[model samples]
Target: QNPERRAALVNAAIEVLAREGARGLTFRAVDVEANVPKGTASNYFPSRDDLFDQVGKRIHERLNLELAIEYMQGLFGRITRDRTGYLALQELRLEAVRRPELRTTLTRTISENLKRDIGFHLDSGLPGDRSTVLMLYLAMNALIVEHLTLPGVLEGVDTERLVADLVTRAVATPDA
Candidate 1:
């Protein structure tokens, strides 16, 4: 576990990244975002990409913790509906494609998340592994994207039912 100071720095990085759109990701911005002294973030991160690499882990942990449940209501209530941190994450998604180090960081964090979820899936009687979880991740991610981007697209679609179905289908046993 990291110290509170480190978490605070990362939290500020997420806020600054979201509100400033990556153009204003200076250590000053992060320090101001965290309401700490000017030199605080510089002390923690010391470099922009270093700050960014940590942000990827922070974002991934926050999201994976929220979606640790078996139900979509948990997903909606805890994650999808109120989207501050996630909105920040979305911004990072846009900026990361061209940044190889960030992309690599996100990739490792993302896989770490899937592997964590595989543990949950195993306990929940669902098939669990890298590939199956990757499949589930793709399907669920697409649903969340459309659901958020075009809210009306799923007007009558129940997220709970939809997620249950998708997850169940993805984890189906070969004989079933």
Candidate 2:
């Protein structure tokens, strides 16, 4: 697939998922969203599952890139940078509960990979264990939701900055 075209289709799928939910994320819908000719999306993403997997893959890939570019702040930036894609994946997270096969693919492709990357990148002295790291990871995600969906959740706080600070705290060694 042409890199640029594939990116457009993937981004279009992200928009469709965020705006229309999984039910509305058809290739045709993506084609229209991308302003590509009818059947073009179909030609590239012949299988529906392929589109689903690719979208998940794309989100994780961007995150991995951020890990290199911005470190912990990178993850925070990635989460808040693309609100639409973030929500779209959130939709898939719920849908995967009812979809055994999709759950498996996304779990491995997105969840496990993301957790592993963060686990590996975290400083050696963070308390507890990988479990603690996991908890902090979820905390960051929750902050993203609070920041995006209900800014009122934090009340005048700069949630992104707070999140960046929380990550620093989560990774710092226990009080001396």
Candidate 3:
């Protein structure tokens, strides 16, 4: 399989999924979007499920890498001062709902990314280990849940202050 062709098909599939949702995903549709022949698309992806799985994996990889970069760059600084991270998280949730097959993949990828991030923090000698990492992950989840379920709770609140508090609490020594 040609790498360029496969990349084209994958990107086209993502565009189709984003624009038309899962229902609009098909080999013929992707082929037309990629400007390739239907047979060529089929050759790369024998079935819709195959194409979807590939697309899902690509989405997972891209998102994880991007988020990891953002997380690292914002670690000693404020990461969630704005709604960008929250919005990205919300988009992932919405994407999962739109394509149920991608739910597990998305969840697993996000968890793995968090684990890597936590390890990065610990390895940097930030005075915490697995427990601190786990706590941070849990806190982030709680914040995300609250943001999604009760946006009003955060209204008029200082996002920068909240993020700073979360980060400080996450990395502080237990006795401190």
Candidate 4:
């Protein structure tokens, strides 16, 4: 298998997963999305489940995230900027509910990333323990879902200030 071709097909699969959801993902759909020959995706991936795993792994690999304040700002900017990637992530999550193998892969990736965030938070002197970082992770995830699906829900509120508040209050650092 050509490495570049495999990557291209997987990337196309990510787009198809986002646009069509997991249930709609197929080798042909990926081929059409990639503008490749009809059987190209199948050649790359032996089966739909194999493609699903590749796409799920690819989605996380593509949706890298960030630091506390600067981190939150960067994350906010990234998610808003790359709606398709984030949407693909969400689709993967939904699909994981029905697919045990996918659930295992995603859970490992997410857990590993969280550990990295916790380590970064401590290493950066960001002022918070593991739970503190976890809180921010959960809060930001909720904010992202609401903001993406229903922007009006957060309307009239200062979104920037809100991101700042999430870090500030979660960190709860006192004046020196």
TM-score for each candidate, following the candidate numbering: 0.75, 0.74, 0.57, 0.89
Better of 1 and 4 by lDDT: 4
* 174: Cα error in model 2, Å: 7.1
Write the residue-wise lDDT of candidate 4 on 58-166 in tens digits.
6667771224577687788787767777778888898899998888888888888899989987887667677678889998888888877788988887877888888
Order the numbered candidates by TM-score, best leading.
Answer: 4, 1, 2, 3
TM-score of 4: 0.89
Candidate 3: global Cα-lDDT? 0.63
Query: Can you tell me which runs of candidate 2 are displaced by over 4 Å?
Result: 1-4, 63-79, 122-128, 158-165, 172-176
Write candidate 2's Cα lDDT for 1-176 as tens digits.
48889988888888888889987888778878985756788888768877887776676554332233245555666666788867888878877786666687778886677677566655543344554467576887787777678878788776556655665565545545
How many clashes does each candidate structure show, in the order listed?
A: 0, 0, 0, 0
Candidate 2 displacement at residue 29 in angstroms = 1.0
lDDT of 3 by residue, 98-145 (tens): 666667766776778887977787667565567767876776666655
Which has the better TM-score: candidate 3, or candidate 4?
A: 4
Model 1: residues with Cα > 4 Å off, grouped in runs? 37-39, 64-70, 80-82, 119-124, 127-132, 174-176
Worst lDDT run of 10 residues, candidate 4, spans 59-68
